[PDB]
Design a protein around this motif. Structure first.
Motif, PDB file in Angstrom:
ATOM      1  N   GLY A   1     -70.900  30.727 -14.546  1.00 48.34           N
ATOM      2  CA  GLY A   1     -71.637  30.226 -15.687  1.00 48.34           C
ATOM      3  C   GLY A   1     -72.808  29.372 -15.255  1.00 48.34           C
ATOM      4  O   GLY A   1     -72.631  28.414 -14.498  1.00 48.34           O
ATOM      5  N   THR A   2     -74.010  29.695 -15.737  1.00 43.28           N
ATOM      6  CA  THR A   2     -75.224  29.064 -15.240  1.00 43.28           C
ATOM      7  C   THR A   2     -76.151  28.581 -16.348  1.00 43.28           C
ATOM      8  O   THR A   2     -77.274  28.157 -16.052  1.00 43.28           O
ATOM      9  CB  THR A   2     -75.995  30.020 -14.320  1.00 43.28           C
ATOM     10  N   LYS A   3     -75.727  28.636 -17.606  1.00 43.15           N
ATOM     11  CA  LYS A   3     -76.546  28.093 -18.676  1.00 43.15           C
ATOM     12  C   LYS A   3     -76.594  26.572 -18.587  1.00 43.15           C
ATOM     13  O   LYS A   3     -75.807  25.939 -17.879  1.00 43.15           O
ATOM     14  CB  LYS A   3     -76.007  28.517 -20.039  1.00 43.15           C
ATOM     15  N   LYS A   4     -77.538  25.981 -19.322  1.00 46.51           N
ATOM     16  CA  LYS A   4     -77.656  24.528 -19.336  1.00 46.51           C
ATOM     17  C   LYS A   4     -76.557  23.855 -20.144  1.00 46.51           C
ATOM     18  O   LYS A   4     -76.449  22.625 -20.106  1.00 46.51           O
ATOM     19  CB  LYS A   4     -79.025  24.111 -19.877  1.00 46.51           C
ATOM     20  N   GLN A   5     -75.752  24.620 -20.877  1.00 47.48           N
ATOM     21  CA  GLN A   5     -74.622  24.084 -21.620  1.00 47.48           C
ATOM     22  C   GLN A   5     -73.309  24.202 -20.863  1.00 47.48           C
ATOM     23  O   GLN A   5     -72.264  23.825 -21.403  1.00 47.48           O
ATOM     24  CB  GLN A   5     -74.490  24.796 -22.971  1.00 47.48           C
ATOM     25  N   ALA A   6     -73.328  24.718 -19.632  1.00 42.31           N
ATOM     26  CA  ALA A   6     -72.097  24.916 -18.884  1.00 42.31           C
ATOM     27  C   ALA A   6     -72.185  24.519 -17.418  1.00 42.31           C
ATOM     28  O   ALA A   6     -71.239  24.791 -16.674  1.00 42.31           O
ATOM     29  CB  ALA A   6     -71.647  26.382 -18.984  1.00 42.31           C
TER      30      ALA A   6
ATOM     31  N   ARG B   1     -77.064  29.345  -9.959  1.00 49.12           N
ATOM     32  CA  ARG B   1     -77.842  30.574  -9.983  1.00 49.12           C
ATOM     33  C   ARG B   1     -77.040  31.670  -9.310  1.00 49.12           C
ATOM     34  O   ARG B   1     -76.582  31.495  -8.178  1.00 49.12           O
ATOM     35  CB  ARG B   1     -79.188  30.395  -9.275  1.00 49.12           C
ATOM     36  N   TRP B   2     -76.875  32.792 -10.000  1.00 45.31           N
ATOM     37  CA  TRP B   2     -76.263  33.954  -9.376  1.00 45.31           C
ATOM     38  C   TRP B   2     -77.249  34.578  -8.400  1.00 45.31           C
ATOM     39  O   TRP B   2     -78.317  35.051  -8.801  1.00 45.31           O
ATOM     40  CB  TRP B   2     -75.836  34.975 -10.426  1.00 45.31           C
TER      41      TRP B   2
END
Ligand SMILES: [Mg+2]
Ligand SMILES: [Mg+2]
Ligand SMILES: [Mg+2]
Ligand SMILES: [Mg+2]
Ligand SMILES: [Mg+2]
Ligand SMILES: [Mg+2]
Ligand SMILES: [Mg+2]
Ligand SMILES: [Mg+2]
Ligand SMILES: [Mg+2]
Length: 231
Positions: free
Chosen positions: A66-71, A90-91
RNA sequence: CGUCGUCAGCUCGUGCCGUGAGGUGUUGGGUUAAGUCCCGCAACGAGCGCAACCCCCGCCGUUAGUUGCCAGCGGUUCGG
């Protein structure tokens, strides 16, 4: 496990910009957004948690992605609570299909961990020192969770498959089952074990990931009570 | 050996995209004399080049003082 607490934290997300294949998990459009059917959420959650428990019993590993700014925070603490690998920032393309080449970099990471200690060496030229310290910072930033991976995993936990389509592609190509939290703009065919929930709100991700990791912890003989909850 | 050209370039392994030639990496933004470095990115790294390692000049120190030099001292046919 869940017992109706889903509604308090979430019901769904996303307006007309939807994937029609998600229609089997939608109930109504009220404000313009799609409300996920919570009974279908519970029915899918039972299957998903059963699969997770069965996998954790046998000793297999789960890669939390998980790489969103909410996670960037929920994923890290939840995956560290189980001592489990994770990807948070980052993947890197080929993190699974090129696992040998990419995992050659964690060897450099660990080698640089044993280099900067006081005992052995501090006589390197300072410019070379700053080069190696840049390299160490980058390696730590991008491979801090990936280090726990010693082999290809048995499942990947993804918090948003639409945002993380490259990871899902790599997993599906390698026949690794994928578990996903997905809102109404997602493609459910690529996800083996779906949980139709909101994945853009903080509390929804927190609840789902925390309780999943509680089940994993239970599947290895123990009960660790406190989790980091952040309003 | 000359030349493009001391120009800033030319490539490779694995991965990924394309039926294929091939592409990506090496594109975009800022910076540098520089593919120099930083940020972002299906790429992650590496090699030959760039730079550095070598020589001369410019400041100072230690070792020494002959055939070198002569501040202080004494001679002097006046040249250390
Ligand atoms: Mg593929
Ligand atoms: Mg040329
Ligand atoms: Mg290639
Ligand atoms: Mg093809
Ligand atoms: Mg080129
Ligand atoms: Mg090219
Ligand atoms: Mg040049
Ligand atoms: Mg270079
Ligand atoms: Mg050079």
């Amino acid at each position: 496990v869940k017992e109706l607490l889903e509604a308090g934290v979430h019901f769904g997300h996303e307006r007309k910009r939807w994937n029609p294949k998600f229609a089997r998990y939608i109930y109504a459009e009220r404000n313009g957004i799609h409300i996920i059917d919570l009974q279908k959420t519970m029915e899918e959650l039972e299957r998903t948690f059963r699969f997770i428990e069965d996998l954790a019993m046998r000793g297999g590993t789960i890669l939390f992605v998980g790489t969103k700014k909410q996670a960037q925070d929920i994923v890290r603490m939840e995956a560290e609570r189980a001592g489990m690998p994770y990807v948070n920032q980052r993947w890197l393309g080929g993190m699974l299909t090129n696992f040998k080449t990419i995992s050659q970099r964690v060897h450099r990471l660990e080698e640089l961990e044993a280099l900067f200690a006081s005992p052995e060496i501090e006589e390197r030229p300072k410019k070379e020192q700053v080069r190696l310290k840049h390299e160490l910072e980058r390696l730590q930033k991008y491979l801090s969770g990936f280090r726990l991976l010693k082999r290809l995993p048995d499942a990947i936990f993804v918090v948003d498959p639409t945002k993380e389509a490259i990871a899902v592609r790599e997993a599906r190509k390698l026949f690794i089952p994928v578990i996903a939290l997905a809102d109404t703009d997602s493609d459910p065919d690529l996800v083996d074990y779906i949980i139709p929930g909101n994945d853009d709100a903080i509390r929804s991700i927190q609840l789902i990931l925390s309780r999943a990791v509680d089940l994993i912890i239970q599947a290895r003989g123990g009960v660790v009570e406190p989790s980091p909850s952040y309003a």
